[PDB]
Structures are given as structure tokens and as C-alpha cells.
Amino acid sequence: TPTVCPVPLAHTPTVTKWFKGITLHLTATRPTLLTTRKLGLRADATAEWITG
Amino acid sequence: ATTHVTATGSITLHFSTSSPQANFIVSLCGKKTTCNAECKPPADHIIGE
């Protein structure tokens, strides 16, 4: 049957400010999925797993 | 869009542009007036708004 389950909200990141870009600071204690995609024609989708 | 009017009053307006050259014409009521000036790029350069 379906039901509702809880999941962690991992440590959200600190965001820098970069010229025509951005640099991030991800923190984790366990493997976690991350990804992003553009908002125009070229999706330029990317995904990754981060351990620490 | 609009504002309260007055016999001789004055107002301040907000706007945005795609160029730093603020040369254009703007219409109030049915009349219009020109507006020329120079705008500078900002310091912050990363926003999703």
C-alpha cells in the first residue's frame, strides 16, 4: 500500500558569487544525489553523487 | 501603471531596461516626454529573479 515516509533534509549549501558562474560549498556525511539543468534551449543537464 | 495626479505635483517611478543607455520616450496621460541618461552595470551578477 502507499503511505507517507520521512526523509532527511541534508545540510543545504553555501553559495558564492562568481563571474558568469557560481562556486558552491556542499557538505554531507553520506552519499547524496545532486543535479542541475539549464533553463534555455540547451539543457546541459548534469548529475553527481557526493560523499562528504 | 498609474498614480494620483495633481495640478502641479511630481512623482518618482521605477523601471528596468536591457541596455545601460537610458535614452527613450515615455508617455503620461496622452502626452509624452523624452528621457536620456546613462546607467551603470551592477556589482552583484548572479540572481534568478
Side-chain angles (χ1 to χ4, degrees), chain A residues 8 27-33 49-52:
Chain A
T27 62
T29 72
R30 203 154 286 153
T32 299
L33 183 63
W49 286 100
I50 308 305
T51 318

PDB file of all heavy atoms in Angstrom, chain A residues 8 27-33 49-52:
ATOM      1  N   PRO A   8      15.499  12.693   5.304  1.00  0.00           N
ATOM      2  CA  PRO A   8      16.315  13.799   5.812  1.00  0.00           C
ATOM      3  C   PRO A   8      16.384  14.955   4.829  1.00  0.00           C
ATOM      4  O   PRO A   8      16.299  14.777   3.612  1.00  0.00           O
ATOM      5  CB  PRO A   8      17.693  13.158   6.009  1.00  0.00           C
ATOM      6  CG  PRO A   8      17.729  12.049   5.028  1.00  0.00           C
ATOM      7  CD  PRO A   8      16.322  11.527   4.939  1.00  0.00           C
ATOM      8  N   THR A  27      28.214  20.095   1.737  1.00  0.00           N
ATOM      9  CA  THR A  27      28.623  19.353   2.925  1.00  0.00           C
ATOM     10  C   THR A  27      27.660  18.195   3.135  1.00  0.00           C
ATOM     11  O   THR A  27      26.441  18.380   3.068  1.00  0.00           O
ATOM     12  CB  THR A  27      28.653  20.248   4.170  1.00  0.00           C
ATOM     13  OG1 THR A  27      27.342  20.758   4.431  1.00  0.00           O
ATOM     14  CG2 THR A  27      29.617  21.414   3.991  1.00  0.00           C
ATOM     15  N   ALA A  28      28.205  17.007   3.388  1.00  0.00           N
ATOM     16  CA  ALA A  28      27.390  15.825   3.609  1.00  0.00           C
ATOM     17  C   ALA A  28      28.169  14.816   4.440  1.00  0.00           C
ATOM     18  O   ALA A  28      29.401  14.849   4.491  1.00  0.00           O
ATOM     19  CB  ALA A  28      26.956  15.187   2.284  1.00  0.00           C
ATOM     20  N   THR A  29      27.430  13.918   5.089  1.00  0.00           N
ATOM     21  CA  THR A  29      28.001  12.806   5.836  1.00  0.00           C
ATOM     22  C   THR A  29      27.686  11.462   5.192  1.00  0.00           C
ATOM     23  O   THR A  29      28.013  10.417   5.764  1.00  0.00           O
ATOM     24  CB  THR A  29      27.490  12.817   7.279  1.00  0.00           C
ATOM     25  OG1 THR A  29      26.116  12.413   7.303  1.00  0.00           O
ATOM     26  CG2 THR A  29      27.617  14.207   7.884  1.00  0.00           C
ATOM     27  N   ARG A  30      27.060  11.467   4.021  1.00  0.00           N
ATOM     28  CA  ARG A  30      26.596  10.249   3.375  1.00  0.00           C
ATOM     29  C   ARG A  30      26.451  10.533   1.887  1.00  0.00           C
ATOM     30  O   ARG A  30      26.276  11.690   1.491  1.00  0.00           O
ATOM     31  CB  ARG A  30      25.258   9.789   3.973  1.00  0.00           C
ATOM     32  CG  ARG A  30      24.946   8.320   3.802  1.00  0.00           C
ATOM     33  CD  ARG A  30      24.018   7.844   4.901  1.00  0.00           C
ATOM     34  NE  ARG A  30      24.706   7.720   6.180  1.00  0.00           N
ATOM     35  CZ  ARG A  30      24.118   7.828   7.365  1.00  0.00           C
ATOM     36  NH1 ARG A  30      22.823   8.076   7.477  1.00  0.00           N
ATOM     37  NH2 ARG A  30      24.850   7.683   8.467  1.00  0.00           N
ATOM     38  N   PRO A  31      26.528   9.508   1.038  1.00  0.00           N
ATOM     39  CA  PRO A  31      26.299   9.742  -0.394  1.00  0.00           C
ATOM     40  C   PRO A  31      24.951  10.404  -0.632  1.00  0.00           C
ATOM     41  O   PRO A  31      23.931  10.005  -0.064  1.00  0.00           O
ATOM     42  CB  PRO A  31      26.361   8.334  -0.994  1.00  0.00           C
ATOM     43  CG  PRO A  31      27.264   7.592  -0.084  1.00  0.00           C
ATOM     44  CD  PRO A  31      26.987   8.130   1.293  1.00  0.00           C
ATOM     45  N   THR A  32      24.954  11.425  -1.485  1.00  0.00           N
ATOM     46  CA  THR A  32      23.764  12.207  -1.780  1.00  0.00           C
ATOM     47  C   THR A  32      23.773  12.591  -3.250  1.00  0.00           C
ATOM     48  O   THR A  32      24.826  12.873  -3.827  1.00  0.00           O
ATOM     49  CB  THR A  32      23.686  13.473  -0.913  1.00  0.00           C
ATOM     50  OG1 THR A  32      23.620  13.108   0.471  1.00  0.00           O
ATOM     51  CG2 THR A  32      22.464  14.311  -1.281  1.00  0.00           C
ATOM     52  N   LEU A  33      22.586  12.609  -3.846  1.00  0.00           N
ATOM     53  CA  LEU A  33      22.436  12.938  -5.253  1.00  0.00           C
ATOM     54  C   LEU A  33      22.286  14.442  -5.429  1.00  0.00           C
ATOM     55  O   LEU A  33      21.573  15.103  -4.669  1.00  0.00           O
ATOM     56  CB  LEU A  33      21.223  12.222  -5.846  1.00  0.00           C
ATOM     57  CG  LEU A  33      20.972  12.421  -7.342  1.00  0.00           C
ATOM     58  CD1 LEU A  33      22.126  11.868  -8.164  1.00  0.00           C
ATOM     59  CD2 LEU A  33      19.657  11.773  -7.750  1.00  0.00           C
ATOM     60  N   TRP A  49      27.043  12.231  -7.546  1.00  0.00           N
ATOM     61  CA  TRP A  49      26.907  11.733  -6.184  1.00  0.00           C
ATOM     62  C   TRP A  49      28.043  12.298  -5.342  1.00  0.00           C
ATOM     63  O   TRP A  49      29.210  12.227  -5.743  1.00  0.00           O
ATOM     64  CB  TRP A  49      26.935  10.203  -6.153  1.00  0.00           C
ATOM     65  CG  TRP A  49      25.680   9.557  -6.653  1.00  0.00           C
ATOM     66  CD1 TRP A  49      25.473   9.019  -7.889  1.00  0.00           C
ATOM     67  CD2 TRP A  49      24.465   9.356  -5.920  1.00  0.00           C
ATOM     68  NE1 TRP A  49      24.200   8.507  -7.975  1.00  0.00           N
ATOM     69  CE2 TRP A  49      23.562   8.700  -6.779  1.00  0.00           C
ATOM     70  CE3 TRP A  49      24.053   9.671  -4.621  1.00  0.00           C
ATOM     71  CZ2 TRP A  49      22.272   8.356  -6.383  1.00  0.00           C
ATOM     72  CZ3 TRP A  49      22.772   9.328  -4.231  1.00  0.00           C
ATOM     73  CH2 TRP A  49      21.898   8.676  -5.107  1.00  0.00           C
ATOM     74  N   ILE A  50      27.702  12.853  -4.183  1.00  0.00           N
ATOM     75  CA  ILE A  50      28.665  13.494  -3.293  1.00  0.00           C
ATOM     76  C   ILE A  50      28.682  12.737  -1.975  1.00  0.00           C
ATOM     77  O   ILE A  50      27.627  12.510  -1.370  1.00  0.00           O
ATOM     78  CB  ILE A  50      28.323  14.977  -3.061  1.00  0.00           C
ATOM     79  CG1 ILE A  50      28.127  15.700  -4.395  1.00  0.00           C
ATOM     80  CG2 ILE A  50      29.416  15.645  -2.244  1.00  0.00           C
ATOM     81  CD1 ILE A  50      29.298  15.576  -5.345  1.00  0.00           C
ATOM     82  N   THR A  51      29.879  12.368  -1.522  1.00  0.00           N
ATOM     83  CA  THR A  51      30.028  11.590  -0.297  1.00  0.00           C
ATOM     84  C   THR A  51      30.181  12.490   0.927  1.00  0.00           C
ATOM     85  O   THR A  51      29.368  12.430   1.855  1.00  0.00           O
ATOM     86  CB  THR A  51      31.233  10.649  -0.416  1.00  0.00           C
ATOM     87  OG1 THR A  51      31.249  10.047  -1.716  1.00  0.00           O
ATOM     88  CG2 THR A  51      31.171   9.565   0.647  1.00  0.00           C
ATOM     89  N   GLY A  52      31.213  13.329   0.937  1.00  0.00           N
ATOM     90  CA  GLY A  52      31.475  14.194   2.070  1.00  0.00           C
ATOM     91  C   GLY A  52      31.168  15.646   1.779  1.00  0.00           C
ATOM     92  O   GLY A  52      30.009  16.011   1.559  1.00  0.00           O
TER      93      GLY A  52
END
